[PDB]
Design an enzyme around this catalytic site. Structure first.
Site, short mmCIF file in Angstrom:
data_model
loop_
_atom_site.label_atom_id
_atom_site.label_comp_id
_atom_site.label_asym_id
_atom_site.label_seq_id
_atom_site.Cartn_x
_atom_site.Cartn_y
_atom_site.Cartn_z
CB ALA A 76 -1.83 1.85 -6.71
NE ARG A 125 5.15 -0.78 -3.99
CZ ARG A 125 6.39 -0.55 -3.59
NH1 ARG A 125 6.26 -0.08 -2.36
NH2 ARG A 125 7.79 -0.58 -4.25
N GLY A 164 -3.51 -2.36 -0.75
CA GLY A 164 -2.19 -2.32 0.26
C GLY A 164 -1.54 -1.04 0.24
CE1 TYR A 165 2.75 3.02 -3.30
CE2 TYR A 165 2.34 2.06 -5.41
CZ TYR A 165 3.13 2.97 -4.73
OH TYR A 165 4.16 3.42 -4.96
NE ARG A 187 -15.65 15.10 -5.09
CZ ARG A 187 -16.87 14.46 -5.62
NH1 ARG A 187 -17.61 14.01 -4.67
NH2 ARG A 187 -16.68 14.63 -6.76
N1 LIG Z 1 10.18 -1.03 -11.95
C1 LIG Z 1 9.10 -1.49 -12.90
C2 LIG Z 1 8.33 -2.77 -12.12
C3 LIG Z 1 6.95 -2.30 -11.33
C4 LIG Z 1 7.02 -2.63 -9.83
O1 LIG Z 1 7.57 -3.61 -9.43
N2 LIG Z 1 6.66 -1.50 -9.29
C5 LIG Z 1 6.38 -1.52 -7.93
C6 LIG Z 1 7.64 -1.63 -7.04
S1 LIG Z 1 9.05 -0.50 -7.07
C7 LIG Z 1 5.51 -0.26 -7.48
O2 LIG Z 1 4.40 -0.51 -7.08
N3 LIG Z 1 6.01 0.88 -7.70
C8 LIG Z 1 5.32 2.15 -7.47
C9 LIG Z 1 6.01 3.22 -8.29
O3 LIG Z 1 6.48 2.85 -9.25
O4 LIG Z 1 5.90 4.52 -7.84
C10 LIG Z 1 8.19 -0.50 -13.76
O5 LIG Z 1 8.53 0.51 -13.08
O6 LIG Z 1 7.39 -1.10 -14.24
#
Ligand SMILES: N[C@@H](CCC(=O)N[C@@H](CS)C(=O)NCC(=O)O)C(=O)O
Ligand SMILES: CCCCCCCCCCCCO[C@@H]1O[C@H](CO)[C@@H](O[C@H]2O[C@H](CO)[C@@H](O)[C@H](O)[C@H]2O)[C@H](O)[C@H]1O
Ligand SMILES: CCCCCCCCCCCCO[C@@H]1O[C@H](CO)[C@@H](O[C@H]2O[C@H](CO)[C@@H](O)[C@H](O)[C@H]2O)[C@H](O)[C@H]1O
Ligand SMILES: CCCCCCCCCCCCO[C@@H]1O[C@H](CO)[C@@H](O[C@H]2O[C@H](CO)[C@@H](O)[C@H](O)[C@H]2O)[C@H](O)[C@H]1O
Ligand SMILES: O=C1CCCC2(CCN(c3cnc4ccccc4n3)CC2)N1Cc1ccccc1
Ligand SMILES: O=C1CCCC2(CCN(c3cnc4ccccc4n3)CC2)N1Cc1ccccc1
Ligand SMILES: O=C1CCCC2(CCN(c3cnc4ccccc4n3)CC2)N1Cc1ccccc1
Ligand SMILES: N[C@@H](CCC(=O)N[C@@H](CS)C(=O)NCC(=O)O)C(=O)O
Ligand SMILES: N[C@@H](CCC(=O)N[C@@H](CS)C(=O)NCC(=O)O)C(=O)O
Ligand SMILES: CCCCCC/C=C\CCCCCCCC(=O)O
Ligand SMILES: CCCCCC/C=C\CCCCCCCC(=O)O
Ligand SMILES: CCCCCC/C=C\CCCCCCCC(=O)O
Ligand SMILES: CCCCCC/C=C\CCCCCCCC(=O)O
Ligand SMILES: CCCCCC/C=C\CCCCCCCC(=O)O
Ligand SMILES: CCCCCC/C=C\CCCCCCCC(=O)O
Ligand SMILES: CCCCCC/C=C\CCCCCCCC(=O)O
Ligand SMILES: CCCCCC/C=C\CCCCCCCC(=O)O
Ligand SMILES: CCCCCC/C=C\CCCCCCCC(=O)O
Ligand SMILES: CCCCCC/C=C\CCCCCCCC(=O)O
Ligand SMILES: CCCCCC/C=C\CCCCCCCC(=O)O
Ligand SMILES: CCCCCC/C=C\CCCCCCCC(=O)O
Ligand SMILES: CCCCCCCCCCCCCCCC(=O)O
Ligand SMILES: CCCCCCCCCCCCCCCC(=O)O
Ligand SMILES: CCCCCCCCCCCCCCCC(=O)O
Ligand SMILES: CCCCCCCCCCCCCCCC(=O)O
Ligand SMILES: CCCCCCCCCCCCCCCC(=O)O
Ligand SMILES: CCCCCCCCCCCCCCCC(=O)O
Ligand SMILES: CCCCCCCCCCCCCCCC(=O)O
Ligand SMILES: CCCCCCCCCCCCCCCC(=O)O
Ligand SMILES: CCCCCCCCCCCCCCCC(=O)O
Lengths: 146, 146, 146
Positions: free
Chosen positions: C52, C104, C96-97, C31
């Protein structure tokens, strides 16, 4: 009683570890192509690894649900073996997809066959635990009580 | 003992089959609009069917967790019936979303009500298995032992 | 027997409620930036809250699987406490994100540590339920029977 489901729990834990491996590969691809979060679109090589991980995560609860229904209602060993076959096909699917969209197809069809087999074992096990009682009640003229 | 959870396992299996149906519709939409993997953006008709499938997958583990907590701690029959109501509302949500974003709203609110009801039954069942023991211990002057 | 898993069921239910909270924040962001469904791309503030939520949903079945394997095979209390630590770290990660991609990171590493600890407890519990029997059978010269 717990050891009657220990094999299913071990296969479940192996599936969790495989998801951590898929997540580690997406982190390595993010650095390799400077596709920083929150961005999910980027070069085709990044997009394939990212889509492979999303597909494996979305199917993880489906593998988990059918592994447990088949393992409890059909036979624990047979379900745990199909679960292992499914996990190994998903690892090959991820590796193939990283190289090309076409190379993901053969291991994807293999993983679909393994998941359909778990679904079939779960259905067979649920029928084995319901149909005999219904048959017994129909022969005794007590189906309404059931 | 397994037959005390056989209804929940059958509803779980039906939810897995419904996810395969949603995946089959996304494959049919990919061919209809030439949106080949790893691509997820495309015409609005493709995007709606794709987003409907993603929403159903993300909520599948939530339905699964609450169905099992409610079915074990509240009553098996009541939880399995709410689970069926939830699955049928999600099928209508998918069908409505495929036609238009607005048509997804009524079945989405229906699915939210069914999921909130499962959450409420799970909470009621957990309270029924904890509060009486705490009340008994408080009346006997043995709450610290608990 | 149900009360031996009631703590795990309560932590599972809390995880389901936290996912509803994450979904409520994505609706509020839709929204705030007029990013109407089926659209998932938009301003960076919308994209972060959306990513997130996707991350928390994809990891929810992993938290669920390890919480239950650790709680049943290791110790119920220890697993439920790690599960609570994981859920609280994921709430901070989401908050945080929403402010920034950098903010985050600290709660994301905290949630990874909590999930790795649940994985370790599940592995320790599975080994505690398999290795003693194998050791007993090897000492008695009956390993093949096992
Ligand atoms: N890369 C893995 C691990 C998840 C992870 O650590 N994601 C964090 C760090 S890259 C995040 O908040 N990423 C945000 C996003 O994927 O857009 C996944 O895609 O499942
Ligand atoms: C309301 C529904 C109406 C009733 C419908 C009834 C349909 C019946 C389906 C046909 C019966 C299936 O046939 C049965 O399949 C299973 C699994 O493939 C076989 O089972 C065998 O192979 C499987 C393969 O994984 C092993 O896991 C299992 O331990 C082994 O015993 C049985 O040997 C066979 O007899
Ligand atoms: C720390 C927390 C403090 C304590 C909080 C206590 C709050 C109590 C909430 C009010 C009690 C709920 O009221 C109770 O609801 C359930 C479900 O709707 C009803 O249950 C009935 O309908 C449900 C609807 O699905 C059926 O599944 C169930 O089999 C049937 O018996 C009870 O007949 C009613 O008495
Ligand atoms: C095929 C595999 C080959 C065999 C491999 C064996 C590896 C063994 C690993 C080392 C043993 C781990 O060491 C053990 O860790 C656990 C958890 O951290 C500790 O456990 C303690 O802390 C944990 C932390 O959450 C609490 O949940 C638990 O209730 C408490 O008792 C034990 O006090 C310690 O003895
Ligand atoms: O594992 C995979 C991965 C690739 C997609 C898919 C195979 C093709 N799909 C099909 C094919 N024929 C169908 C016939 C009737 C109903 C639906 C059908 N869906 C869609 C699901 N599966 C099988 C699956 C998925 C989820 C749960 C259970 C099984
Ligand atoms: O099923 C759906 C689908 C549509 C979104 C949603 C309904 C609106 N949402 C709301 C509304 N009011 C709230 C009040 C307090 C906390 C959060 C709240 N979230 C977000 C969740 N649900 C309910 C749900 C989702 C996951 C787990 C349990 C229940
Ligand atoms: O919770 C998180 C969130 C952030 C990503 C991640 C931490 C970094 N990642 C790593 C790091 N080192 C590794 C070493 C060997 C194998 C894989 C590895 N993966 C990828 C997973 N985890 C841990 C996790 C995820 C799923 C299941 C179990 C645990
Ligand atoms: N279409 C279903 C089935 C999943 C599937 O078969 N996906 C394969 C074949 S299209 C894949 O790897 N797709 C990559 C992608 O979705 O981008 C879904 O979206 O869940
Ligand atoms: N916003 C939450 C709740 C889910 C939800 O209510 N989604 C509906 C209403 S926005 C939907 O069909 N959205 C389509 C989309 O997300 O693209 C989430 O993202 O999980
Ligand atoms: C509800 C019964 C589901 C049966 C579908 C299983 C199919 C498997 C193909 C091999
Ligand atoms: C409801 C019908 C159950 C069918 C599942 C069994 C099928 C194939 C076994 C291989
Ligand atoms: C294949 C799908 C089979 C479905 C029927 C199984 C239902 C089992 C009912 C058991 C009775 C009960 O739980 O009270
Ligand atoms: C080999 C499979 C054959 C199954 C035999 C079933 C026998 C009779 C079915 C009649 C059902 C109608 C009777 C209702 C009365 C009651 O059972 O309570
Ligand atoms: C922790 C208790 C959760 C209660 C929320 C259930 C709400 C349902 C609306 C009908
Ligand atoms: C923790 C409070 C539990 C509340 C759940 C019961 C609510 C509504 C029943 C319909
Ligand atoms: C509604 C949410 C209710 C939460 C309280 C239930 C916790 C049950 C504790 C049982 C005791 C135990 O497992 O040792
Ligand atoms: C109808 C609900 C009323 C509940 C009645 C509870 C009774 C007394 C509460 C006092 C708690 C403080 C005493 C601590 C000593 C102990 O119980 O071990
Ligand atoms: C299969 C065993 C998995 C062990 C990995 C657990 C690691 C935890 C880091 C703290
Ligand atoms: C398969 C090896 C199991 C290792 C898990 C235990 C590790 C660390 C405990 C903290
Ligand atoms: C750490 C991972 C440990 C894996 C081994 C555990 C397997 C337990 C087998 C129990 C025997 C059975 O279920 O028949
Ligand atoms: C303290 C850990 C030491 C473990 C001791 C194991 C003892 C002997 C291992 C030999 C295995 C080969 C014998 C096979 C015959 C059989 O056990 O059936
Ligand atoms: C993900 C599916 C839920 C897990 C299955 C519940 C275990 C039932 C065990 C009864 C014996
Ligand atoms: C393929 C393996 C065949 C079935 C293995 C059965 C072991 C567990 C027995 C049971 O759970 O009834
Ligand atoms: C990552 C999982 C590996 C498991 C490979 C074993 C499969 C073969 C089953 C027969
Ligand atoms: C997805 C939630 C986990 C499944 C619930 C565990 C089954 C407990 C049965 C104890 C009797
Ligand atoms: C709505 C149905 C009412 C509850 C059905 C109860 C059947 C299972 C009994 C139990 O698990 O305690
Ligand atoms: C795809 C699931 C269909 C189930 C429909 C039955 C729901 C009605 C419950 C009363
Ligand atoms: C999501 C993991 C599946 C839930 C674990 C199954 C419960 C087994 C209980 C046996 C006692
Ligand atoms: C950190 C808490 C330590 C372990 C708590 C054990 C309580 C449950 C006991 C069991 O399931 O064996
Ligand atoms: C949203 C979950 C909140 C739980 C916070 C309690 C974690 C502290 C465990 C010690």
């Amino acid at each position: 009683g717990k050891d009657e489901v220990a094999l299913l729990a071990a296969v479940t834990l192996l599936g969790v570890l495989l998801q951590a491996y898929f997540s580690l590969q997406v982190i390595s691809a993010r650095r390799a192509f400077r596709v920083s979060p929150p961005l999910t679109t980027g070069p085709p090589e990044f997009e394939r690894v990212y889509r492979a991980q999303v597909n494996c995560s979305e199917y993880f609860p489906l593998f988990l649900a059918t592994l447990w229904v088949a393992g409890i209602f059909f036979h624990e060993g047979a379900a745990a073996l199909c679960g292992l076959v499914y996990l190994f096909a998903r690892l090959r699917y991820f590796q193939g997809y990283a190289r090309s969209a076409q190379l993901r197809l053969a291991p994807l069809y293999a993983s679909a066959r393994a998941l359909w087999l778990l679904v079939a074992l779960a259905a067979l096990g649920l029928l084995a635990h319901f149909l005999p009682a219904a048959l017994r009640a129909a022969l005794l003229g007590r189906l309404r009580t059931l």
